[PDB]
Design a protein around this ligand. Structure first.
Ligand SMILES: COc1cc(Br)cc(CN2CCC(NC(=O)CCCS)CC2)c1OC
Length: 344
């Protein structure tokens, strides 16, 4: 119902993702940790990298255990794997034994000037490194505690909330609308229709999910596939008459597969969401598929209902809106052949 302790527990810089305070080891070592639904490793700085405010000092932790194994993660960082006791101060009052990759070497990972020292992957074991046998933090948390298999994110344009183990109904207006998680690797969803200011792109819905479509807190932009990206910008440029290519400095609706056969709902983002104050055009091309980043997520309260293999969307109580236009989650809509849109 209400999780006052966990409200406003996220911070960050625009374009750099959101981080939460966590503790590792015994006695607890406090670190700021990126919240990433697009990856599945819990990894922290473990050596005195010049950019870092602080780092995990294994020698100070009585509860640390070595797994005597190494991990190389390119996007790069490299680490030594182990386990230790982990807590989230402004989260549930629990302590779990989780896997931690102690980052010993990295290139273009840590950001000069940033206030975070690690990454928390909230996605599933499938995309975990080195392989799926390394249990992600959230999978460990659910198994070792009575914390429900669910988390939600209210990312605001920089602070936000990560509600672990439930939903805070103060953080959204209207109703929650759910889309199925297609496969438990990334938080994979299916987009069935795309409108630019009320007009359908008339594109094959297979193109909207070319390779995959994901909800990703680790990505800043709405990243559309090349073919969709091209057609989207074409309608975006026509609606308002280098920059469009992300080389320099009208609402958008995505229809998502519903819970029921032939039933969909739409989520609608304003310019106030895809114009990121630096302004920059926060919609870019991709070759890995559709990535619903902070652009999408900042308009909505997002429920990662892992228990029921679904993701909830509702209008965020903190989203930037004026007296003219407001962000929206609306349904139900009738959409046939939705299963076809999934790439195989
Ligand atoms: C500031 O730097 C980061 C902040 C945060 Br929060 C997370 C990361 C790492 N994260 C790794 C997974 C990526 N997503 C995918 O591979 C799916 C394709 C999406 S189009 C997104 C970036 C970051 O990079 C190091």
């Amino acid at each position: 119902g209400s999780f006052v302790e966990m409200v406003d527990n996220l911070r960050g810089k625009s374009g750099q993702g959101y981080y939460v305070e966590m503790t590792v080891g015994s006695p607890p070592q406090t670190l700021n940790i990126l919240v990433d639904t697009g990856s599945s490793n819990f990894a922290v700085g473990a050596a005195p990298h010049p950019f870092l405010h602080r780092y995990y000092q294994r020698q100070l932790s009585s509860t640390y255990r070595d797994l005597r194994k190494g991990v190389y993660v390119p996007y790069k960082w490299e680490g030594e794997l182990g386990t230790d006791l982990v807590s989230i101060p402004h989260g549930p009052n629990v302590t779990v034994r989780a896997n931690i990759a102690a980052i010993t070497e990295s290139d273009k990972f840590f950001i000069n000037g940033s206030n975070w020292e690690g990454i928390l992957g909230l996605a599933y074991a499938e995309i975990a490194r080195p392989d799926d046998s390394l249990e992600p933090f959230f999978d460990s948390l659910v198994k070792q505690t009575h914390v429900p298999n669910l988390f939600s994110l209210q990312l605001c344009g920089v602070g936000g909330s990560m509600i672990i183990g439930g939903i805070d109904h103060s953080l959204y207006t209207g109703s929650l609308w759910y889309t199925p998680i297609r496969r438990e690797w990334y938080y994979e969803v299916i987009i069935v229709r795309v409108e630019i200011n009320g007009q359908d792109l008339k594109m094959d819905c297979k193109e909207y999910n070319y390779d995959k479509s994901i909800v990703d807190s680790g990505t800043t932009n709405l990243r559309l596939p090349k073919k969709v990206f091209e057609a989207a910008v074409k309608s975006i440029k026509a609606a308002s008459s280098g920059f469009w290519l992300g080389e320099q400095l009208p609402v958008i609706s995505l229809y998502l597969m519903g819970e029921v056969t032939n039933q969909s709902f739409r989520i609608t983002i304003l310019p106030q969401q895809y114009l990121r104050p630096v302004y920059k055009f926060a919609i870019s091309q991709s070759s890995t598929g559709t990535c619903m980043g902070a652009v999408i997520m900042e308009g909505f309260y997002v429920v990662f209902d892992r228990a029921r293999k679904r993701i909830g969307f509702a209008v965020s109580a903190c989203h930037v809106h004026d007296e003219f236009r407001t962000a929206a989650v609306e349904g139900p809509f009738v959409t046939l052949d939705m299963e076809d849109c999934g790439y195989n």
